[PDB]
Amino acid sequence: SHNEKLAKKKIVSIDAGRKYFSPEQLKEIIDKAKHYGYTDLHLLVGNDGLRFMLDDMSITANGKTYASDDVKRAIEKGTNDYYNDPNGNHLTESQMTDLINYAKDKGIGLIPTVNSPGHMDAILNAMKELGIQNPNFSYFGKKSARTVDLDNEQAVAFTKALIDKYAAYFAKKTEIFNIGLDEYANDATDAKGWSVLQADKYYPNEGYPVKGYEKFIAYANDLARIVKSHGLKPMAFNDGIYYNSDTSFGSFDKDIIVSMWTGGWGGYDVASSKLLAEKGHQILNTNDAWYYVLGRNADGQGWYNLDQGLNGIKNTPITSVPKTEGADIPIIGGMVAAWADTPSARYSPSRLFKLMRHFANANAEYFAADYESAEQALNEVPKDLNRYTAESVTAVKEAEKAIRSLDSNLSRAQQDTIDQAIAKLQETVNNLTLT
């Protein structure tokens, strides 16, 4: 099923929420993505930091409009409070439109993430700068820097309107919008946030958040509705979706594509990919086997170091989804992810490209071949062959025909077929003999 494999999405994810990436850096990543046979760039722009500003950032919520220039000041400041990156603060609308167009012309899509209700430090800060009160979730006196309180109607309304503003921009120029949903209050609860949101149902009268997880389902579904209204497919990370396999709080919108990144860990019991598929969700395999955190560049340098990610790529194929329960889990594609958890780390293009190249090579039948050198070779053939001998001319014409007769849907596994055809053309041109 070569055609089914090549039809899958192959995606590189870049955390440009925590850390600034310039348009030039992002274009270079797009170029490499295209070369290695990827289909999409997944660009987080809201992920702790918020690093994408529309021309009009005015937000209507809470019975008022927050002025564009105030929302911009609030977000720039709020992002800087998370991390004031010396390289830059945000991409502009003009830059994003140009980047999406640049990618489109190369056959690469762009999938944005603007994360909530977790990983939203900068939006929380921005809301406080606008004057919204107490937006942050707290757990027995420990305030999350990252997560909104779903009981705070003003904070929730603002956040939804902000997501809507971005989704309206991305409408018609993208296909999928990642609303995130990972790791609720991971700081304040020591990575127990879903358990906390579920706890009051089963452990009442203990001070746990009343209707916490029910409100989360409603929030996720309302963001899904917002995204869908703009003709975009919503996507979200898996960990909070039917956490603890618990279907008793409500149901998630089936139109949410699941980015399946984790199988969970000790005391963090996530729904299996089997359960999620059976509930009607499509799955993008985002296995954290393949993760790379910038600056963790070799064995021993911490979790998700480059050597660990390269090992994960070698040992966990694109078809291996987290927590399958032994079931056959279909996928829409696979996504290798680079993250900026320590955003002051130096971004190394060569290390990212090595990760990308290894993912492509390890799953070569899924990745598109590279035809650009073949097209260049054709452009370099002498146009007029009259002055050469008939025998030598025929050989060039046959070699050109052979290139133009290559299957246009070859995989990276078949690159040598293309490269051999290029070499043969070059040989025949070199052998052109003047009459």
Ligand SMILES: CC(=O)N[C@H]1/C(=N/OC(=O)Nc2ccccc2)O[C@H](CO)[C@@H](O)[C@@H]1O
């Ligand atoms: C969806 C996702 O990956 N969320 C976070 C994320 N979550 O990963 C974990 O929490 N992983 C983990 C948890 C417990 C034990 C081992 C790994 O990993 C990335 C790399 O650190 C972070 O940049 C992301 O923000």
